[PDB]
Symmetry: C3
Subunit: 275 residues, 3 copies
């Protein structure tokens, strides 16, 4: 019966006894998510009394164009409802998928979370909204269709599903681990990652615009092309091992600011933590 929306996860932490002020045309899905909370359609809004929910990105453009929005802080005081992959200051869940802090993605990757193709997405990871993650259909039967199964009776379905589960090429991502997407990852526009054949986008990996990723991407590799190939690595092997031990992406806010100089300068990072 429908898991927790991003908006509900935010309102549970930040509403703080205010009323939700809906900026835009309310939808069936929004009204259901708002049932636990006091809400009304927005007119004059004040962050002391109101939490502003823009329904669509279009409504958010309008809200942020309004003089009233000046005193509203992102996430703390306002959000967009139709933004399930939007970044948040806290770790959360997108369907059954853990998502780290300040990590964002778009509708294709939200769907991949819904489909079970993703195990988790790390911290401080930036995924262009047009990136896509999908699986392969079966390639070892007479047909390649999936929706033919809407015509299968109980006995036919059983035989079909049995064969799918034994296929070592993992059609529909069967019999494989869902993919882990690391921290400090960047994925470009129109990139594609194949969920039948990829289990790992390593920490720090960069996926170029338009890349077609068919196998795992090592940590801090930069991959480009159709099919994607490793073009370079962001850092030396010694610094990659250092990054994988330090895991700055799990630091507290205090520590991130404490060490902003090492985050900004790789040379300083190596002097401090490379031992």
């Amino acid at each position: 019966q429908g898991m927790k929306t991003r908006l509900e996860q935010v309102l549970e932490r930040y509403l703080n006894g205010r009323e939700v002020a809906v900026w835009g045309v309310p939808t069936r899905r929004l009204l259901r998510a708002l049932k636990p909370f006091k809400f009304h359609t927005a007119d004059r809004v004040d962050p002391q009394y109101h939490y502003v929910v823009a329904v669509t990105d279009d409504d958010l453009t309008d809200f942020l164009s309004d003089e009233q929005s000046k005193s509203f802080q992102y996430a703390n005081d306002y959000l967009t409802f139709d933004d399930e992959g939007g970044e948040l200051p806290f770790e959360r869940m997108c369907f059954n998928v853990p998502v780290g802090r300040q990590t964002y993605f778009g509708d294709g990757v939200v769907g991949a979370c819904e489909n079970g193709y993703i195990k988790s997405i790390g911290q401080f990871t930036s995924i262009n909204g047009t990136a896509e993650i999908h699986a392969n259909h079966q390639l070892n039967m007479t047909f390649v269709s999936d929706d033919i199964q809407n015509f299968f009776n109980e006995e036919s379905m059983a035989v079909f599903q049995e064969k799918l589960r034994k296929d070592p090429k993992h059609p529909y991502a069967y019999s494989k681990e869902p993919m882990t997407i690391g921290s400090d990852v960047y994925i470009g526009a129109h990139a594609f990652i194949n969920a039948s054949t990829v289990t790992s986008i390593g920490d720090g990996a960069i996926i170029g615009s338009g890349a077609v990723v068919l196998e795992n991407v090592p940590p801090f590799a930069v991959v480009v092309g159709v099919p994607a190939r490793i073009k370079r690595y962001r850092f030396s092997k010694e610094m990659i091992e250092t990054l994988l031990r330090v895991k700055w992406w799990d630091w507290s806010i205090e520590e991130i600011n404490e060490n902003v100089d090492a985050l900004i300068s790789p040379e300083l990072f190596m002097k401090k933590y490379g031992s």
Copy 2:
């Protein structure tokens, strides 16, 4: 022409009232004009046919306790899903589309633009696939909307040269393309409507492929531009498949012969 929803209601509404689940639109109210309808409150499949307006509306309906007795297509549909699969052969802007065949808004647009002659049965097209034609490449300009400034005589001269162009700008002077049955087309794939007339039965078009020429039956093509990497089956089994046309079988026949559909070795034994 008739929307997907109107085709479905003509088949299955069976004298019920349409219960609109979500905010109604101009397009929806026009599609519902010959039918009785009301905004949904309490619904029951004996009295109501539920129309979720958007995909998000459908998510909310299918999460609701009231949806348990509603069967897909027989009792509910999404209005904004012109490319959605159906258990019967339908029309998409008077493009014939086979059973259990789905595609995204780009291919819906290609149907509306006249680029597609028909789409076969059991064909799976990822929602981000695109089908577009080329502009003219043999004039001083490549713009199309410059024509909004052409008077009647200039327009006629422009239109006549486009018609004579062997490279088929805007898919002029060529057949709209046939997309076969049991076809798979992956994400961000592109098919050029100026230069493609046939995606053969059984073809597989890889994610990101840019298809500039016809794809033979059961060819697997990948790359920019798309090249044949392999065929799915031997020449002998392709000939058998193109005769048998299992994609035209009844539901009874599909279940009767599920073993041949699961196992290509058994299909060849049985039919080849």
Copy 3:
């Protein structure tokens, strides 16, 4: 504030009529319509009404309706949710000049709003799925941008200072916004990198799927990932003539008087080539 496409068109063509809204209104639309008299469309007449279709789907509904028969595009009707749609006059898109008969989709509107685009020329055709984005910084320990939401004032200043000095222009810092020329074509799923591109030359053709990482010369055709020059549309001498003549700045009268040279490059060179 900045004027929507609709507001600019109404200021030009409304001519004292009343706006007849066709479709479910939005908060964006109602704000744009505040200077004007408007009502929900019922019976409409282009002598009396200017029809605003809210969505593309609303427009399809309106144009299928018998009442639309005498309505002329732009002069009498428009789609609100079509900020990159073509117009017969030069307009602004989020304070970016856009030439006549030039269209583009929501990715390029976004790039206008983000400050990535200086101007877009006349008679330019950009597929709806084209994208224009910048690079993140590539010279620090992290590639994330939204880590900066955790930066205090001191940390943010140190971060912004390095970004400003980066010669590779992360987030399009310290570079000119890009000019997109006239009579340009940009295909489906094309990508143009705003960190490293300042010019798409007049006449350029960017093929579908192309990933454009550097300037595209005038009348060059580029394809692939990354994008490379496939061919030029015309000879060097004709390119030089086209850049002199600038037919894309001609009046409607000049376009029609010279349609033979616009259709035939040979005739263009005969009339304008030295």
